[PDB]
Amino acid sequence: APQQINDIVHRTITPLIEQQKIPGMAVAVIYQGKPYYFTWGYADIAKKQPVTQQTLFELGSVSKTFTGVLGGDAIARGEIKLSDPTTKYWPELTAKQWNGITLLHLATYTAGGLPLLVPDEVKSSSDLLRFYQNWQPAWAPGTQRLEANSSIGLFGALAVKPSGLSFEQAMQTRVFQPLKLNHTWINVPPAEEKNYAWGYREGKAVHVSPGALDAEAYGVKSTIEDMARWVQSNLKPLDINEKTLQQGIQLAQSRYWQTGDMYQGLGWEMLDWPVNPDSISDNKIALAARPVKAITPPTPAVRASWVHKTGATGGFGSYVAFIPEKELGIVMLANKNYPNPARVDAAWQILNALQ
């Protein structure tokens, strides 16, 4: 890389790895549209496998950006509308609380207090219908935001219903394959297992456990090369040749709701750039309910934005940020779940120094 990039990334990430005891890390910076890669540590401590540009990391909540874009692509295809009632796509959802809950609400965590996780004792398609039928909202729809894998995960499952495809098949054919994300996976194939990093949680090697709507909310594993390509695609959607996908990326960066200085997209979250770095979590907050103000109608993707998403599984911590008006971006993938503020701090320190 150019020495300026080299030096800001290594002076920022080296002490981050130290302080947070991160076993393994990959970083990509996208600087004038062009990726630059950096790796440290181990992907598997016991087997002494290093992190490389081909290491797969669990993206956790960053997976939601893929679900938001796949949903955007389905809207652009005319298969769904965000204004549609949920019940249009799941008619057996007959319980009265669902009257007035739209796909917009599900995609943006505004349905009225759907939980962070679907309960572990929900396995089957009948178990999932009972869970949603029996769920009692705390709030009226479109009033309060509570980040929820049960919310955006249901959005993703319903958004693909009119295509006739499974969620994975729609994701593969409509998002991963057009963007040449050939080492990005909902289910890691046997051939790629040698590249799949272990996560580490209290010294113990761990992968993300199966659960209900886990592909749709937190199930994507990717490399630092494919995640750099995902940032480039989201920075510059008009270079994408597949029309509905280009439009789906644009819809995922539209501003649907405002809480404080943040704006809720489909998966992506946004602030106005330039951004105060204390204004940009899990500083160990298990549940953070916030009032939202509708942006009526949604603002199309603002190029002067800090667009980002954090992500965690038990063993992994991910972070993606980018600034369309500067052609700048960053992906940080780690095999430890370390505090969200340390992620945002390091990302800001890097990108600020490069504009």
By CB under 6 A, name the binding residues for ligand MXG.
Answer: 60-61, 116-117, 147, 149, 201, 206, 208-209, 218, 282, 286, 311-315, 337
- Give CA–CA dist 156/154, Å, rounded: 5
Nearest to K ion of 44, 214 (CB atom): 214
User: Is 83 part of the annotated catalytic residue set?
Assistant: no
- Sign of torsion, CA 272 273 274 277? positive
Pick one of K ion, ligand MXG, none as the site partner of residue 326 (Cβ within 5 to 8 A by kind). none
Nearest to ligand MXG of 237, 311 (CB atom): 311
Nearest approach in angstroms of CB 61 to ligand MXG is 3
- Give CA–CA dist 231/68, Å, rounded: 14
- Give CA–CA dist 83/7, Å, rounded: 47
Nearest to ligand MXG of 57, 273 (CB atom): 57
- Sign of torsion, CA 185 189 194 196? positive
Instruction: Name 143's Cβ contacts closer than 8 Å, sequence gap at least 6.
Output: 110, 112, 291, 292
Nearest approach in angstroms of CB 186 to ligand MXG is 14
Closest residue by Cα to residue 211 from 295, 302, 120, 309: 120
Nearest approach in angstroms of CB 123 to ligand MXG is 14
Nearest approach in angstroms of CB 212 to ligand MXG is 11
Catalytic residue among 61, 63, 222, 254: 61
CB 289 within 8 A of CB 146: yes
How is residue 330 written in tokens?
Answer: 């960053």
* Touching K ion, residues 207-226 (CB under 5 A): 214
Pick one of K ion, ligand MXG, none as the site partner of residue 61 (Cβ within 5 to 8 A by kind). ligand MXG
Nearest to ligand MXG of 213, 350 (CB atom): 213
Closest residue by Cα to residue 116 from 214, 235, 188, 20: 214
CA Rg, the chain, in Å?
Answer: 19
Nearest approach in angstroms of CB 108 to K ion is 22
| Residues 139-178: x where in contact with K ion by CB under 5 A, - otherwise, as a string | ----------------------------------------
- Give CA–CA dist 206/75, Å, rounded: 36
Instruction: Name 206's Cβ contacts closer than 8 Å, sequence gap at least 6.
Output: 198, 199, 200, 314, 315
- Number of residues forming the site for K ion (CB under 5 A): 1
Residue nearest to K ion (CB): 214
Nearest to ligand MXG of 238, 286 (CB atom): 286
| Binding residues for K ion (CB under 5 A) | 214
Active site residues: 61
